[PDB]
Amino acid sequence: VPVYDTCTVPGSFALTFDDGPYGFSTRLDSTLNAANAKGSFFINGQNWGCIYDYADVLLERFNNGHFIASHTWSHVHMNQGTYEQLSHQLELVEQAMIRILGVKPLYMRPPYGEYNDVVLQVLRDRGYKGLIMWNQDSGDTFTPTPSSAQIIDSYRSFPEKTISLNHEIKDFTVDQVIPAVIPILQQKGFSLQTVPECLGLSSDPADWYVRVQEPGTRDDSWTCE
Ligand SMILES: O=C(NO)c1ccccc1
Ligand SMILES: [Zn+2]
């Protein structure tokens, strides 16, 4: 399976967000949507909330052309898992997206940026088309944590074709950084694209997923316990 860390489309720039959705996600998506900016979201199943409790955010995200991909169910250190454990960690997110959205993801980003040959083999066997890394880090999960002003200033020098790592579980990323950096990036000539579009893969959201069935209605299986 191919590993990607840099866009190829001239002028493109990928704002990417890990570990969500979360309690500020509706705000984040409204900010992106108001600027016609597209985000890439690498979601968990049970980590900072249960994915089924975020179904409405996920549906808005899906239907507005944002890119949704897997970050594993439980945010595991994948280099420590067996083939079978990793397959389960991916299957569980696939199943949630099948229930909520009717589709399976074709892409994923490994927690901690940690992967190996077992990870790549599981991805190949499960039909994934790509493992998505990054090439610039906002620092929003560094500890001690930089200020929003520091993060915004770092964004002023991230060049074209950046795939930027952010975490939507950080309130200041949603409330301070992204509202400041969208105009910085758009006004200097960058196109805020999803990762597949910026890689010269398809710009059609339907090509980022495999349709399995019609989206489900919420029932008692929409649970993480
Ligand atoms: O899982 C992660 N981000 O979503 C991660 C964690 C540590 C370092 C780099 C990335
Ligand atoms: Zn993560």
Residue numbers in the entry: 41 to 265
Quoted from the paper:
Phytopathogenic fungi secrete chitin deacetylase (CDA) to escape the host’s immunological defense during infection. Five crystal structures of two representative and phylogenetically distant phytopathogenic fungal CDAs, VdPDA1 from Verticillium dahliae and Pst_13661 from Puccinia striiformis f. sp. tritici, were obtained in ligand-free and inhibitor-bound forms. Our findings revealed that phytopathogenic fungal CDAs share common structural features, and provided BHA as a lead compound for the design of CDA inhibitors aimed at attenuating crop fungal diseases.
As the crystal structures revealed that Zn2+ was coordinated by the Asp-His-His triad, we considered metal ion chelators, specifically BHA and its derivatives, as potential inhibitors of CDA. To prove that BHA functioned as a metal ion chelator of CDAs, the crystal structures of Pst_13661 in complex with BHA and compounds 2 and 3 were resolved. BHA chelates a zinc ion in bidentate mode. The hydroxamic acid moiety of BHA forms three hydrogen bond interactions with the enzyme: (i) its C = O with the NH backbone of Tyr152, (ii) its NH with the imidazole group of catalytic His207, and (iii) its OH with the carboxylic acid group of Asp58. The benzene ring moiety of BHA fits a cavity formed by the nonpolar residue Leu205 and the aromatic residues Tyr152 and Trp174. The crystal structures of Pst_13661 complexed with BHA or its derivatives suggest that BHA inhibits the activity of Pst_13661 by binding to the zinc ion. We obtained benzohydroxamic acid (BHA), a lead compound, by structure-guided screening, which showed high activity against diseases in cotton, wheat, and soybean caused by V. dahliae and four other top 10 fungal plant pathogens for molecular plant pathology, namely P. striiformis f. sp. tritici, F. oxysporum, Fusarium graminearum, and Rhizoctonia solani.
